[PDB]
């Protein structure tokens, strides 16, 4: 029972730690991708505008 409890605690901590590392790294990356998407969308529209 104690082993299972310690294991659950250990796993719980591991998940919390691993997630925090990923999150801190991830947050900066999503913004860059979205910015590029919007920029490409605008560029395409501009191109479609000059053609018309």
């Amino acid at each position: 029972v104690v082993m299972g409890g310690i294991a659950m605690m250990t796993a719980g901590a591991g998940g919390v730690i691993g997630g925090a590392i990923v999150l801190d790294k991830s947050l900066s990356a999503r913004e860059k991708l979205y910015r590029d998407r919007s920029q490409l969308n605008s560029e395409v529209l501009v191109a479609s505008q000059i053609g018309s």
Binding site: M3, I6, A7, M8, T10, A11, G12, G14, G15, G18
Partner: protein, 46 residues
């Protein structure tokens, strides 16, 4: 068509989260398994 698409897109995110859940649960199970295996490897085969 647009409404059937938004309804299908809603139905798709559920499976997308269901996969995200399985991936995390696996990560914890492995993490816990490693700690247990290391402990058990003191002797205690089960």
């Amino acid at each position: 068509v647009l409404e059937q698409l938004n309804r299908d897109i809603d139905g798709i995110n559920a499976a997308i989260d269901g996969a995200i859940a399985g991936i995390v649960v696996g990560g914890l199970l492995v993490i816990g398994g490693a700690i247990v295996t290391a402990i058990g490897a003191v002797a205690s085969t089960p």
